Amino acid sequence: ASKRALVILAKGAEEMETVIPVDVMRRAGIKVTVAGLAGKDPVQCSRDVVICPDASLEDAKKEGPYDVVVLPGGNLGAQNLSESAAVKEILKEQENRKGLIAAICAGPTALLAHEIGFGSKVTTHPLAKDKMMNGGHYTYSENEVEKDGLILTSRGPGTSFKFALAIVEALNGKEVAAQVKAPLVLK
Amino acid sequence: ASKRALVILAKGAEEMETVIPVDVMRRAGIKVTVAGLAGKDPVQCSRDVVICPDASLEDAKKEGPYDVVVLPGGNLGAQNLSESAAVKEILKEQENRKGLIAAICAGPTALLAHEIGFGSKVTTHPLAKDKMMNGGHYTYSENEVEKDGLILTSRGPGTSFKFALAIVEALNGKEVAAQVKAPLVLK
Ligand SMILES: [Cl-]
Ligand SMILES: [Cl-]
């Protein structure tokens, strides 16, 4: 069966960090569900791009499990993810079943909020480092993409392609990732 | 006054090539209007991301002129742009008033369809070269971004950041482009 990805989309999400992974994962033949944190309604992203989610998170979370749960960044988006009990439950379940969790920019700070993957090497946007490192529960990395087992993190809009291709490689292998990469006109 | 950009959004547009320039231009303090070719309704992009335009093209075209007109790629999106009489009128007017026209991936093939900027050096997605070069009306480039006066072209999803920053540099200058670039985590 095809792999499945849940992308959790909150108000104030960075739209580039949402769309790049969604699009690249779909190019890889992954079934992606863009799930709205607040419900089924369109979501106003950080730079005012408005995206219509495929489903509410309430509905999508009942259609698990997923091979990856993806958390976009954006400062306000990540704060919304961090404050959500539903996100907490989803991430804890994903961690418990040894499934991949991928987060970019400010996204990884939601891992901290929900006590996910402590002891991992992680990266974040430079401006989100202090929040992520509060308490020293992770070890910090400046790599564009960091993968420590099932915790996959990345830095910012500009590292979104590498982040998305890392998810593809983790799920579908190096060859598929290379096949998907070539038509993107990268490197 | 702030610069103004018109981004024309058609069904089958490449969502990455739509969102990256919109977001980066807004980071640069440009007033961007995402205008739906077909009207006010949400637009199903090439990888099924659904974007709600700010306005219909019918309405937005009456609120010109714009400092840049931006054509995203996506094979089917670009075909829709190429077939549109409204797009023809907008591009001809922009060309006539010596305003910037920016197109990426398959997007530049709409310049060919509407007989815009003949004699320019252009680039496109590798797979769109043959369509763009039909008749030899342009000279082809393999640069990630090509700017020949007021015709600014680029290659693919992976060159979208360079494309968007080139638009910012053209409108608001090198220093603003560098300021906007740094937080994106590029290079
Ligand atoms: Cl942000
Ligand atoms: Cl396409």
Curated annotation (Swiss-Prot), chains A, B:
Q: Which residues carry this modification: Phosphotyrosine?
A: Y66
For membrane topology, the record states:
Lipid-anchor
Where are the Cysteine sulfinic acid (-SO2H) modifications?
A: C105
Resulting phenotype, C45A = Reduces protein stability. No effect on oxidation
What results from changing K129R?
Answer: Partially compensates for loss of stability
Q: Which PANTHER family match?
A: PARKINSON DISEASE PROTEIN 7 HOMOLOG (PTHR48094:SF12), PROTEIN/NUCLEIC ACID DEGLYCASE DJ-1-RELATED (PTHR48094)
Quote the disease note of the record: Parkinson disease 7: A neurodegenerative disorder characterized by resting tremor, postural tremor, bradykinesia, muscular rigidity, anxiety and psychotic episodes. PARK7 has onset before 40 years, slow progression and initial good response to levodopa. Some patients may show traits reminiscent of amyotrophic lateral sclerosis-parkinsonism/dementia complex (Guam disease).
Its subunit composition reads: Homodimer. Binds EFCAB6/DJBP and PIAS2. Part of a ternary complex containing PARK7, EFCAB6/DJBP and AR. Interacts (via N-terminus) with OTUD7B. Interacts with BBS1, HIPK1, CLCF1 and MTERF. Forms a complex with PINK1 and PRKN. Interacts (via C-terminus) with NCF1; the interaction is enhanced by LPS and modulates NCF1 phosphorylation and membrane translocation. Interacts with NENF.
Task: Provide the family line.
Answer: Belongs to the peptidase C56 family.
Q: Know the name of this protein?
A: Parkinson disease protein 7
| Gene name, Swiss-Prot/TrEMBL | PARK7
